[PDB]
């Protein structure tokens, strides 16, 4: 090991879902900086072209796809493999809807589980195929502190359920592909200052509880989550598989 | 304070999904014997009459219903509340399908998540509505050791993820309803000698591994899991909510 | 299994450390009620004779011993075995001292670790000997939510460390003696309304945080912890070993 | 935001206990290479000069000290702060002793807890005093997979408990010091090829079990653990506190 460059991704190609926004985009930045070539994936065209414009030459492909469409993920991988061999997958596509359990409509529940969990499996199966064949790769899933504990004061039982699945999916694929050289880990972030959370931050009857419940007393910055993903996705994490890495300002300690 | 009857369910009415087979049936027996009345729910009509014929007078209703059909769970709660106020719910309806991640049909993934996760939500929302209203209720979810660790040597990634979701779902509804007097807990059984594990117990290249990995060196008995559901469901467990109780012969210890 | 009497301890003898107060004494009550004969252990003579006076004929022996003195535990077991064969051990002797980490005196730290952890091992080794020889027994340790998360707002790093050890000691002995028929589990209680906590309850700048941090919004009652121990120590828990059972009003869910 | 140097330790001074051997030494190498200066601490004087002779100019001091001696850690912090303000602490000093629970000498139990647990507290209190004062610091504790699960087939109950205490100690000091800008995290390595595991790696009735139980089918390399300590210690991990990071080749996954 050469510690100086062991955190770099030189030569590597990363597929990132949810690349057009928030944490997904900051990981694209981090990975570009680190020597990686990129495959940007996002359902949102406007967002994607912005991502790509900014990331410039590190962009191998930019693909408009919904992670819940499993043949779009199979198609995306095939495209990917032609263009650059993909050795890293970051599953950042996710959504969160507030709801009370007794006033949940079936579509809200089904959709959160479809994006957060099904989509993550479809992407991991599509891209993990070529990794498992080469006997080499790394996957990093965006879980949440919500896969460990339950947020307060707001209710979103479908998000909590989805993040529980995410953590165990992570471990299930880690165990299954360990012997064949693919590592799979998850980040479990606390509150992060991105697009997913701005609406919730503008109400102080919520934001105040948030910070008082977090030992560091602040939201994380997207770059703080990106750095953790960078670590997990790089050769520095070569003995790290099936791990749930908490990046939460201590929220889960209390 | 009466310790000799703290574990009893006298004058309660419990709804049990998966009542037709294995652990769900043993639970009904356990609850019948502790003085509860039973609302029995299974998609298998044949299994239901057998269950009901055996339970006798303890049976207040038997309802053929697919837990994945949200509007059928809601109706089932309506029917059940009309016979007697339902103060206990056991979500035991569930499936397992073996599959290699790379060779997974979309439909297998979808269906395991539908029954194990979506179905538990649909039932819990339907039956918990009146409990929340009353300020009183106990729900027992069938989680698994598979929501904490990953089984070997067989592969079933959908199952691990579904059980991750079961544990977080349990915790989310525990948190949301604690203030209104409804407790929500899960069991995380190890291998149990039932119908769900018959095909696999017939295969020593799986079976000898199972016992080896189990400190107690044996499968659990359906009644060992039932006794533990009885605890969670009873007044004995009145300060226990959001708990995931391992009943696994030490499996998650190693 | 006969569910009606499966929670009873008829014929059994339980050694309980910390029997003179709080949770230890309420478990003596619960176990007496349930058909068990008792060995009371406590360093405090006044407390012990009060315990024994109240528990009456269920008391086989009453022994004044400090759990940190390992030959007193070896001696106590030998005495025990002459008088009644001890098939159940409850480790409830424990202490808690508030301190700031940077203003901790070495004696406070050493003493908490000595009572909470060393004492628990000395008792478990002394009494577990005869259980392991018979190939039968049950141990229940008093862990804490403090072995999982960190209390707030008060500081007691030595208590948190001690409870971490307690949970893993539990699992280590469960794994070691599983094959030889001794089960070992821990309770991890939340705030409980006993002697250990009255001082802390009388300051509202503390008590208020406590309840607001607990989903059920109340302290537990000693009987709620006793019922859980009763469950773990009885034949109902026969497939339950190495488990950490949270009894905390949901405190660890959030 | 500079991802190319986020993992660097330029201008920091790190104190490492257990610097003389195995993982503690590899960590020093890692930190030396990331631009940090080193305060080296070990009870073995011989091992220290070897460490220091190899590290070269990166070594600001080498201090022979027994971590179990509280007043020696305090003095060591005083000495170290006088050379350069210490902003990183790695608590790597630790031992393992195999013993059957029933045949355990008191002294073995005591000594494993003294080094692994008490010693980490003494060092963390001593070095964290000035860090807390500065409003800035990172501590990395050497936890273990043995603080989460129990090893097999060999028995070492003191070690499992000590590591339980290490994980909760880490979390307690994370919570207490988060508001004053000192992060505190632990690693939970799997088997690592070092001096601590040489005797046991020589015994195939243990060794073949070790690898079988490890999804990655191999021991970790000291440098794989070091790379992960570097992450925790660096600005890359700035929103990570109270985390227990598994570096175990998937061991805790099964
Ligand atoms: N506080 C936080 O932001 C926070 C905390 C913990 C975990 N996380 C998780 O980390 C991940 C990223 O969240 P973040 O805030 O950047 O979110 P974000 O909303 O800022 O970004 C999400 C991105 O995913 C895309 N997306 C949504 N559904 C999609 C679909 N079906 N197909 C393709 N793309 C889709 C959106 O277009 C968007 O670009 C999510 O999995 C989230 O649940 C976020
Ligand atoms: N080894 C084990 O048996 C084991 C271990 C851990 C957890 N569990 C969990 O315990 C629960 C019950 O398992 P068990 O072995 O009795 O299984 P089982 O297969 O014996 O019984 C399952 C019952 O659920 C019913 N069911 C299935 N889908 C349904 C649907 N959509 N609607 C209504 N009813 C439906 C089936 O008809 C059957 O009667 C499951 O959640 C399972 O995952 C089992
Ligand atoms: N809020 C709570 O009370 C709470 C919460 C979580 C866990 N617990 C744990 O459950 C257990 C019991 O606490 P509880 O409130 O009854 O405490 P308590 O102080 O009411 O009772 C403790 C008893 O243990 C005895 N004791 C203390 N040190 C001893 C020693 N060295 N040898 C023998 N006896 C000794 C005391 O004499 C007393 O009778 C402890 O392990 C405690 O840490 C308590
Ligand atoms: N398989 C593994 O090696 C493994 C796995 C998980 C965790 N760990 C943990 O990592 C840490 C370091 O282990 P490692 O294998 O390098 O061990 P090692 O035995 O190679 O190195 C331990 C170092 O600590 C020093 N030391 C011991 N007692 C001391 C004391 N009282 N004061 C000062 N120094 C003392 C020793 O001299 C030695 O240099 C330990 O806490 C260990 O429990 C090791
Ligand atoms: Mg919490
Ligand atoms: Mg395991």
Account of the protein in words:
4 copies of one chain form a homotetramer. Chain A is an alpha/beta fold and 254 residues long. Chain A has helices at 22-33, 45-55, 70-83, 106-134, 157-177, 198-201, 204-212, 222-233, and strands at 13-17, 37-42, 59-64, 88-91, 137-142, 182-189, 244-247. In chain A, 44% of the residues lie in helices and 15% in strands. The first copy, chain A, starts with 12 loop residues before the first strand and ends in a 7-residue tail after the last strand. Chain A is globular, with a radius of gyration of 17 Å. Chain A is built from 8 helices and 7 strands. Chains in contact: A-B, A-C, A-D, B-C, B-D, C-D. Bound molecules: nicotinamide-adenine-dinucleotide (NAD) (4 copies) and magnesium ion (2 copies). One magnesium ion sits between chains A (149, 252, 254) and C (149, 252, 254). One magnesium ion (MG) binds next to loops of chain B. Chains A, B, C, D: InterPro entries: NAD(P)-bd_dom_sf, SDR_fam. Chains A, B, C, D: It comes from Cereibacter sphaeroides (strain ATCC 17023 / DSM 158 / JCM 6121 / CCUG 31486 / LMG 2827 / NBRC 12203 / NCIMB 8253 / ATH 2.4.1.). Chains A, B, C, D: It holds the Pfam family adh_short_C2. Chains A, B, C, D: Belongs to the short-chain dehydrogenases/reductases (SDR) family.
